[PDB]
DNA sequence: AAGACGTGGAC
DNA sequence: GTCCAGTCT
């Protein structure tokens, strides 16, 4: 931790001064700063910080304002359906986030009388989907509590400023980072300080090509001070790799490679009054892509003939007997999840001329807005481009 | 206390 | 292509 109170003070002043001048104009920042009711403000921050988990700012811009305009308050979100939530979340990824946001709103309404808890400890304790980061973000930004937070951005800044080379995922290191953040967080402007540290990590102290020469905390940064000395060395010196400079920190966490999986899926198309329709069925409410809609799918089979037989069996559960000779193998889609690389073999079957529950026939316009994973949107685009004679293009 | 859980923007 | 932008169990 920082040993000199003078430095802690300078860190805060420099960072906040830079932030007040350089911060990006972000929709949830404006909305939180401008909302005067505390339960509305806290809800607005809550939504944005859930959407931002493992998701880039540029992506969340496309979702946040639409969410807040539809469901401006806890109570609006609490009364909505999970199907509606999943439609709005389609494309954001990690769909349990949307589900827990709505469950959390229901819990605040039903069990806490509509009142958002006002401290990071009670937010974390009471709200599913709200871990230590989101709770401290809501508490500092919405309520002004002097709690510091560590996300990926802040961990990178702190590991460079303090030259921490050990593995940041380790319990010892993660503990040091949270203590540093709690030491540094400005008591009078805790929310802006936390947003400023994240902003610095996102726009200046970046994963690669950090802009140290424009950085507000350069003179306090240990990695920078070591790089400045080594820039001058007129002779080589023969785990710190001089050619990486400050990007030596943090130690690059290596992801476990993804499990390979394969599946076969079929787009079934039929004419309709208001346009052609395709068949969607609903996934189970647990596990991968829980509760989202998809084209009927079966697991992989060790021969083409077996694969077609399984697919037609699955398809017939939902549509009745179908012409097997019209089934076409159209292509494949290789879709990456964090832990699975899933290869879908795409089939189509267009019919030339009742619906069990758990199935839906949708037009092209209805499908574009439906609660479907991006994997299935890719599948549909293969069908669109490759199925002879389709009208869905 | 590693693995489940989506997707895409940058380089 | 590879990396990075949290929560829960
Ligand atoms: S001087 Fe460079 S490495 Fe240090 S905090 Fe600033 S941008 Fe990051």
């Amino acid at each position: 931790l920082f040993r000199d109170v003078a430095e802690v003070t300078a860190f805060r002043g420099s960072l906040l001064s830079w932030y007040d001048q350089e911060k990006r104009d972000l929709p949830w920042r404006r909305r939180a700063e401008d909302e005067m009711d505390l339960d509305r403000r806290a809800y607005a921050v809550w939504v944005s910080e859930v959407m931002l988990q493992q998701t880039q700012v540029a992506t969340v811009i496309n979702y946040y304002t639409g969410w807040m305009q539809k469901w401006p308050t806890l109570q609006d979100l609490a009364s909505a359906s999970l199907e509606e939530v999943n439609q709005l979340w389609a494309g954001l990824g990690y769909y349990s986030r949307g589900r827990r946001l709505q469950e959390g709103a229901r819990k605040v309404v039903e069990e806490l009388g509509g009142h958002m808890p006002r401290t990071a400890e009670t937010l974390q304790q009471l709200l599913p989907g709200v871990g230590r980061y989101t709770a401290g973000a809501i508490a500092s930004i919405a309520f002004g509590q002097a709690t510091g937070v560590v996300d990926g951005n802040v961990a990178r800044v702190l590991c460079r400023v303090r030259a921490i080379g050990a593995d940041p995922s380790s319990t010892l290191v993660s503990q040091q980072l949270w203590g540093l953040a709690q030491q540094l967080v400005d008591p009078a402007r805790p929310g802006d300080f936390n947003q400023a540290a994240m902003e610095l990590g996102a726009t200046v102290c970046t994963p690669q090509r950090p802009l140290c020469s424009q950085c507000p905390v350069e003179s306090l940064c240990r990695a920078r001070q070591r790089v400045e000395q080594e820039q001058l060395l007129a002779s080589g010196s023969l785990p710190w790799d001089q050619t990486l400079g400050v990007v030596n920190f943090p130690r690059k966490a290596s992801r476990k490679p993804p499990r390979e999986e394969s599946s076969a899926t079929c787009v079934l198309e039929q004419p309709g009054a208001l346009g052609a329709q395709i068949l969607l069925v609903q996934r189970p409410n647990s596990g991968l892509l829980a509760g989202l809609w998809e084209f009927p799918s079966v697991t992989w089979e060790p021969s083409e003939q077996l694969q077609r037989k399984a697919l037609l069996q699955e398809l017939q559960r939902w549509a009745g007997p179908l012409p097997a000779t019209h089934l076409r193998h159209l292509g494949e889609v290789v879709h990456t999840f964090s832990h699975i690389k899933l290869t879908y073999q795409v089939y189509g079957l267009a019919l030339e001329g009742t619906v069990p529950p758990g199935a839906r026939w949708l037009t092209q316009e209805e499908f574009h807005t439906a609660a479907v994973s991006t994997a299935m949107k890719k599948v549909f685009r293969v069908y669109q481009g490759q199925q002879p004679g389709t009208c869905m293009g």
Side-chain angles (χ1 to χ4, degrees), chain A residues 160-161 204-205 212 215 217-218 221 224 246:
Chain A
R160 291 164 175 184
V161 169
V204 171
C205 189
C212 306
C215 172
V217 295
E218 169 184 16
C221 173
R224 177 61 169 172
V246 306

Side-chain angles (χ1 to χ4, degrees), chain A residues 107 119-120 122-128 130 135:
Chain A
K107 180 159 178 186
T119 66
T122 57
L123 288 156
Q124 188 174 353
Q125 189 161 19
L126 293 165
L127 303 181
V130 172

Side-chain angles (χ1 to χ4, degrees), chain A residues 264-284 286-334:
Chain A
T265 186
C266 187
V267 178
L268 178 67
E269 179 184 343
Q270 84 186 138
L274 314 164
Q277 307 184 113
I278 53 181
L279 171 65
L280 283 302
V281 298
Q282 181 171 32
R283 290 178 61 83
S286 67
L288 201 68
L289 300 171
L292 300 186
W293 298 79
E294 74 178 3
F295 300 103
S297 299
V298 300
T299 185
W300 76 275
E301 297 289 335
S303 82
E304 185 70 29
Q305 294 87 323
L306 284 162
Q307 191 77 83
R308 289 170 171 265
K309 187 172 149 121
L311 251 182
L312 281 159
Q313 178 183 145
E314 171 69 14
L315 286 166
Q316 290 178 153
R317 303 173 51 199
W318 309 103
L322 301 171
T325 60
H326 301 190
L327 182 67
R328 300 177 167 278
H329 188 199
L330 295 178
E332 58 175 38
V333 172
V334 178

Side-chain angles (χ1 to χ4, degrees), chain A residues 69-120 122-228 230-250:
Chain A
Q69 281 304 122
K70 184 173 185 87
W71 296 311
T73 73
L74 287 159
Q75 289 84 3
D76 299 321
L77 179 56
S79 295
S81 75
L82 176 58
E83 184 64 46
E84 294 177 291
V85 165
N86 286 340
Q87 290 183 259
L88 261 77
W89 214 263
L92 261 176
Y94 288 165
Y95 295 90
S96 291
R97 296 180 299 163
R99 173 175 57 82
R100 295 175 174 149
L101 205 33
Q102 161 171 83
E103 288 172 355
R106 275 165 186 158
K107 180 159 178 186
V108 172
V109 168
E110 310 287 33
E111 317 197 37
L112 308 169
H115 306 288
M116 292 286 292
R118 300 187 149 169
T119 66
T122 57
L123 288 156
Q124 188 174 353
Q125 189 161 19
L126 293 165
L127 303 181
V130 172
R132 192 177 181 190
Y133 164 81
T134 304
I138 295 163
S140 63
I141 295 165
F143 301 119
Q145 184 192 1
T147 304
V149 293
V150 185
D151 69 350
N153 290 305
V154 170
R156 171 170 58 259
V157 169
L158 291 179
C159 286
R160 291 164 175 184
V161 169
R162 305 304 284 167
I164 292 152
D167 182 0
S169 67
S170 96
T171 300
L172 174 67
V173 176
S174 176
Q175 162 160 29
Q176 287 171 35
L177 295 184
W178 282 91
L180 274 167
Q182 195 53 43
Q183 174 182 23
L184 291 175
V185 63
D186 187 86
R189 306 180 57 196
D192 281 354
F193 177 92
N194 287 333
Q195 291 202 83
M198 291 189 273
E199 189 87 354
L200 182 76
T203 67
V204 171
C205 189
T206 52
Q208 305 284 330
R209 296 262 182 255
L211 305 181
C212 306
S213 290
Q214 287 81 41
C215 172
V217 295
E218 169 184 16
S219 71
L220 302 172
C221 173
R222 270 168 193 176
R224 177 61 169 172
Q225 292 315 113
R226 180 178 187 167
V227 165
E228 286 190 33
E230 297 185 352
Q231 289 175 347
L232 296 166
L233 291 171
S235 170
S237 30
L238 190 51
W240 174 278
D241 180 356
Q242 181 168 349
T243 71
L244 293 188
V246 306
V247 177
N248 278 280
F249 307 126

